[PDB]
Design a binder for these strands. Sequence first.
RNA 1: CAAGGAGGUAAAAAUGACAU
RNA 2: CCGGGCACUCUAACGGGACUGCCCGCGAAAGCGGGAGGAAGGAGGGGACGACGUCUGGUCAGCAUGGCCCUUACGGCCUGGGCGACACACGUGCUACAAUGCCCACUACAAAGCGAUGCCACCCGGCAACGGGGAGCUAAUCGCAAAAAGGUGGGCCCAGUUCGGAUUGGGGUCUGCAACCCGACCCCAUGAAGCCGGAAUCGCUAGUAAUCGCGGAUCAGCCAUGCCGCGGUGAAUACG
Lengths: 118, 99, 206, 60, 155, 82, 25, 91, 128
Amino acid sequence: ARIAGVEIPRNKRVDVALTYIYGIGKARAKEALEKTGINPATRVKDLTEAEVVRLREYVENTWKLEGELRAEVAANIKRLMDIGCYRGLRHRRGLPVRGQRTRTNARTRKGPRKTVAG
Amino acid sequence: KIRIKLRGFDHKTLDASAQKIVEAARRSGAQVSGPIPLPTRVRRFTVIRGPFKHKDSREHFELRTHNRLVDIINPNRKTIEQLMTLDLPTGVEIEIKTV
Amino acid sequence: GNKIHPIGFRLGITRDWESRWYAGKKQYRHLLLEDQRIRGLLEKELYSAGLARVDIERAADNVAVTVHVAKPGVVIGRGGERIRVLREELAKLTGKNVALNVQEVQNPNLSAPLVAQRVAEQIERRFAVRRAIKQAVQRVMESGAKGAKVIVSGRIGGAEQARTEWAAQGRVPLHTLRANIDYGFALARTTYGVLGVKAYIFLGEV
Amino acid sequence: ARKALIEKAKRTPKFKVRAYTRCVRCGRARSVYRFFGLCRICLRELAHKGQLPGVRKASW
Amino acid sequence: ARRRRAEVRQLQPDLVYGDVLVTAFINKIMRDGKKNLAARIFYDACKIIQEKTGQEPLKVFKQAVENVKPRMEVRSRRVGGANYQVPMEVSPRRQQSLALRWLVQAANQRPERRAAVRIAHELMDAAEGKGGAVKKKEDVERMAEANRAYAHYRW
Amino acid sequence: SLKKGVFVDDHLLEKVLELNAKGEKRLIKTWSRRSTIVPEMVGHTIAVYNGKQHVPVYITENMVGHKLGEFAPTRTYRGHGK
Amino acid sequence: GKGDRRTRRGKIWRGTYGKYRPRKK
Amino acid sequence: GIKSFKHKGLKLLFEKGVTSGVPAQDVDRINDRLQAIDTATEIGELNRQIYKLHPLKGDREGYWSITVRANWRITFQFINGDAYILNYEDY
Amino acid sequence: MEQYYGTGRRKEAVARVFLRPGNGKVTVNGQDFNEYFQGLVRAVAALEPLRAVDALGHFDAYITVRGGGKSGQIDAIKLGIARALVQYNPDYRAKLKPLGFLTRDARVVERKKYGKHKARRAPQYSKR
RNA sequence: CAAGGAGGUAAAAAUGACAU
RNA sequence: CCGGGCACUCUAACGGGACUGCCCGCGAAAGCGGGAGGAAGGAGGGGACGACGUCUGGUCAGCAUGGCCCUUACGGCCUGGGCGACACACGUGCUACAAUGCCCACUACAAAGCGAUGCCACCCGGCAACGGGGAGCUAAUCGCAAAAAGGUGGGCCCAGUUCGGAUUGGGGUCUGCAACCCGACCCCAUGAAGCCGGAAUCGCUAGUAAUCGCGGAUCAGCCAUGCCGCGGUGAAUACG
Ligand SMILES: [Mg+2]
Ligand SMILES: [Mg+2]
Ligand SMILES: [Mg+2]
Ligand SMILES: [Mg+2]
Ligand SMILES: [Mg+2]
Ligand SMILES: [Mg+2]
Ligand SMILES: [Mg+2]
Ligand SMILES: [Mg+2]
Ligand SMILES: [Mg+2]
Ligand SMILES: [Mg+2]
Ligand SMILES: [Mg+2]
Ligand SMILES: [Mg+2]
Ligand SMILES: [Zn+2]
């Protein structure tokens, strides 16, 4: 069911199916279905349409999620555009933000190795 | 009623000096609970064997701190008389309290 | 080479301590520093006595200090000085019972610290070291020893080339625990540097 | 910087976190045991000397 | 240089069976030193044997090992920078070890989901002479078969 | 991350506040990121030390939890052969 | 998941406690 | 022209005149050598008898070695009128 | 009710075994010799010396155990059970020796030695 | 029992380092 | 827990205990093989212990010390920066790629050590880190700690997935004068690479390898996944 921006997860437990949304994770998941009052271990296969409506209405509202909060997150990094701080430059150069070790490692932001040789 | 504790680094001096007080209390009119061997508190530390920088292969030392307990019944000034200031330690720390 | 200090190697069985007092934390650190500063202050103005040991015992403000010496010539009869303020100058940073005793080391030729110190004096007298080693060993061996061994290492007789002079008669088993082996060491200060003298003296045991 | 540096180690004023341990026999700032107030080097020396009350070789 | 011929290690017999063999098998099942999980899996699979066949697992397991026994194996030896492969006989100790090892390995090679059903099935297949371990056994004997040429080098 | 403290340098603020009544001049230095962005005197320039020299950083809202020296990189890097 | 800060197992490994590993009872 | 240093003491003596990285009695010696390696337009100029010049062998191939004093060497790579990796080291 | 020695030890484990001559084959300590040892296959091997003798439940087990983990405790119980029946039946020695149910088994965890990563596992190196 | 006199002989594997 | 008792367990102090002494066989002897003998054996299993010497080894940055040099400075104080930089290369590791596995709940079983200028029970606020209280403990008394792998129950169902946790946004806490450069945790959201590793290369022969957690030193805090220790479960194989 097209809950937020997504619909994908069929026969696979609503507490888990919920996770498949940028903004839900695991904590907001069971938090949303206990506050909506729905059984977590259900089929996800389009069960009681009412439960699905209530779920959708609560989840999609309340807190920001999916493409909207991706925009906000990207905009929070755009904050350090202008004449920003040190943390912005780390987002500029493509290097780790939290001042860690970059002599080795840091491949998750630098990307795969390039090898200079000399 | 009178409880005495004797701590020490050397066990041979302890096992002997805290046995004197068993003889000097028994032959003065009292029942004495003998040398109670409280467990030892071993304080180890491990130091790199060389002044340089040879991390593997070092050498460690330990400082064993022994505890020994003895209790005497009635606090009569007959037994008190002898164990009052007839002390013969080599630095052995002694605790005397009644409760 | 690499060999463990024959004193520390014993400590427990054979060769007892040199500073025998008990304390828990918050006290050990302070009392050990004071203890070492006593050893440091004594060694200075008492070297002419040539002290084999500096035993120390404590019992809450009691601080007993036993100075072993070959010839206690620097004590000189009660109020003849060399003891009075001398054993009283300790309590200028202590203030506790400065009970200073003096022992008479009978044979200095059987006291390892004294042997090495006599040798280290001779190095600074510009003596022929190899001959000095030989004599000192025989001198120790002459006074009833079961085994002896003296070692001077480095810069022998000046001359740019660190050497190591070696001599040892009789029996010196360092590996054995029931050993009764006295170990001494001395720094010889020379106008060309510093060299170390080891001295091993051995007697029976079982 | 060594002599004026064993000065500060005992001077200990100005902010409580600027104060640090320091071997007394030497002037070592590293591997300084709080129990003895000595570096690991000095501690080994004196332990072999016998000048360390109770301190004995560890074999087990 | 093996001055001692290294005496054969002996095991503890299991529970309910008394095997001098089953425990050796449970050991191969064992990973990270968890004999509890290991023994459980085997006895679990023993319960599984009872279902698909009315046979006592003490024989099903026994015969399976007997069918996954290498009569002769290939051994690389001497002269020519160790160029030859003499086909050697296999000691009862080694047939023992290979049988159980190949069983467990082939068992975990199977596409099944539970460890017990893999063990049970691989044992049933091996008892018949069908298991992937039996493949391994028959394969090792092919190699030993093709090398009869310089087998006379023996030793 | 402080919560009940949330501090700024007293000496930075002394110089900053007594030069805040009815206006000032942007000539104002420091020697400590340690501080915090400080609201008021936003239209200001604080020459922060980076270890070598005093970099004129400029405040134009937007900044807060970022004290100073984040607006004063201490290293240079610039490139690695390329 | 010895390195995930959202498990009783990762909280053990890290040492610290929390929501995913309460201080007993 | 000298273009890169590997030894910090050497680096400081030639750049700032900081002499506290080298022996005190080898200050003048090391200096005249460095200036020679700086002025050298080709390895052939670093060939005076008092330098005992020679290229190294093995893993140090591509390097050269003039003699300062005793067992002490200044090693470098000379290429196209320039020396690189000026090191001061045991023989 | 009764008493029969009991001193079984194995790898830092202490077990005092009693047994009281009664047909009730019973347990001790926490719950059952089961229950307390459930899910544990080799737990029931501690009662093997009873199988070695003629005890199909002739005794009422009473074993207080401490130290180590279950397996060592179970091993220690085996040593204690055997230590009981060999005590009040001195002729039951001729089965505790051939079967070897009487040994403290000095096999204990070896000390972490310096340099090595753990006991014997060397820290692994490359020359280059 | 204890050996002398006879004959087929390893491979594919090169180099050397910085004052005496 | 009390009365009382201390024979069990434990605690720690000295002792006893095998020396192939006893049996068969081999041998000239030394010794070897085998067997009841017992907890144990033919150095029982581990430590401490490292010959003459070798490497112009290491180490003047622990310390001592010859010689050279520096002295309004190559010394001294301070704030700030830096040792944490990153196109890359190597070593030692930690965490994984999952179902003999992961998550949640319940429920057991250790040793060795550390603490009253601290360890902090039990309550109270808090999703939690943690904060307020506040008892006991100069500590085989009180506390750190519930050991964890295990067991029981339940849920995922093999798909980059409830595997995996990197990276990044946001919100907090604690130490600290202060954590931007550079602190550790906590909570929400992101959820990357990895589906088991080319040429090569390492460790271990019995409590061992493997796997699991615990303690301590340094320490205000901590970049510790390191080092030094502790015990839990516990293989495989050795023809040669
Ligand atoms: Mg960094
Ligand atoms: Mg290492
Ligand atoms: Mg320090
Ligand atoms: Mg272990
Ligand atoms: Mg050639
Ligand atoms: Mg020996
Ligand atoms: Mg050299
Ligand atoms: Mg110096
Ligand atoms: Mg560094
Ligand atoms: Mg991928
Ligand atoms: Mg897969
Ligand atoms: Mg071995
Ligand atoms: Zn020191």
